[PDB]
Amino acid sequence: KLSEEQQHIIAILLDAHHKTYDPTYADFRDFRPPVRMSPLSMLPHLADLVSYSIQKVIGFAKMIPGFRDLTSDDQIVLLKSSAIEVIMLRSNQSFTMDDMSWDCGSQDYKYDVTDVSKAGHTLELIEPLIKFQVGLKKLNLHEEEHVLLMAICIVSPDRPGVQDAKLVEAIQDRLSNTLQTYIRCRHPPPGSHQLYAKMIQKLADLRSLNEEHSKQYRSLSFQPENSMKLTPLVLEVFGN
């Protein structure tokens, strides 16, 4: 029951992800070095990771079918609101259940709760974020499902400042329908059971996560010296 257009969409999203997500993490050498010794010692390194990750997310978004039809202003508002959420989603691929940390192929680039804390973020974001990663990890999505969830997250009609809500909604619905149809046709029970609903529930968790991130960003960002450590893209996207 999976249409040719739907398989097309999946092929494109997979490729787009492959182009935007490097499982070697080779580019991490370019970031300011991580410092675990010290308040905000990880802030420069993780600010660079985030900023880099924002770029990669933008490049994935552009590849999504129908995203280009949207106005530039609509494209900007969608990316601005979703950026953090997609980064949290995409981060699942580095996240490991064994040690509860994000493992990027090296001990230096292996990030735990204390490293995140060293970035200036409270347990109020981090505890629910780790839970999110565990629950997402538990789902064991196919890669196809992962890429589709990211795309559906970016193209959301209810994001603040959207103008063409009717059009953003039409794009999303095609991707949602593609996902629903994929699970049914390609995803075997029992893992399939309630999988779409569970994935949609992850999008709601991401909104909460986003909201908290904003608050902690606003506090951290509010002091000038901490804001100095950030990148210019981070300042623009997350607000100056």
Binding site: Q55, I58, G59, A61, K62, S72, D73, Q75, I76, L79, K80, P232, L233, E236, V237
Partner: peptide
């Protein structure tokens, strides 16, 4: 709306 870097990357 004052997002030059984002607009450029988007383009």
């Amino acid at each position: 709306k004052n997002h030059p870097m984002l607009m450029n990357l988007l383009k």
